[PDB]
């Protein structure tokens, strides 16, 4: 399960190429984050010369997920790969592009933007 | 997985409540189905008075599978219980009403009247 020190892929053109989970958002005891959770954490690699650098600590929600979701009618999705999406305080995205399918589960958390912007969500 | 002896649900109004797999087509070496194949079974439930009786042999669809599918998008779908819908040598279904969700990969082995009629397709 994706927790503190677990690798994320970005699926954005933030810049950020892979984070580094410190935390799940969401209150005491939180530990595991899945589809549409928001994690802070710590960029580990980024293309040089941009807007967000390696080191720096940003907020992401998480767009796919390996576990996957099990959903109310009788149907389970899940991914090949855990990634994430970079974004700002109000949901939004900071790239403006989003690379690869997302869950729709993101819809019900209020990620708008990021499921307009989706190549195709499932 | 679904194989000889396995049993299924059916997810349509033919009147077959549960069928018994006796084969996969397909093929000398066929053995196990997922979604898109087709089995040759026998009806162990039915409702009664109805077209199709217990002790049948039908033909049907594999629609839905505990064991799913993995995609060319990185996506791995599975479902909740191991599902069928009886049709005809040409393919259509037998009965009117299809229930449940069903995979979209059953587009590409041309069951298009099933997807029209599902409630949704996955």
Request: hydrophobic residues 40%.
């Amino acid at each position: 399960m994706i927790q503190q020190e677990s690798r994320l892929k970005v699926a954005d053109n933030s810049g950020a190429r892979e984070v580094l989970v410190i935390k799940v958002l969401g209150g005491s005891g939180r530990r595991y984050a899945n589809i549409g959770d928001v994690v802070v954490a710590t960029v580990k690699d980024a293309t040089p010369g941009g807007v967000v650098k390696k080191g720096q600590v940003v907020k992401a929600v998480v767009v796919r997920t390996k576990r996957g979701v099990r959903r109310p009618d009788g149907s389970y999705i899940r991914f090949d790969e855990n990634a994430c999406v970079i974004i700002r305080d109000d949901k939004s995205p900071r790239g403006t592009r989003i690379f690869g399918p997302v869950a729709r589960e993101l819809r019900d958390k209020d990620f708008m933007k990021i499921i307009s912007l989706a190549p195709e969500v499932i």
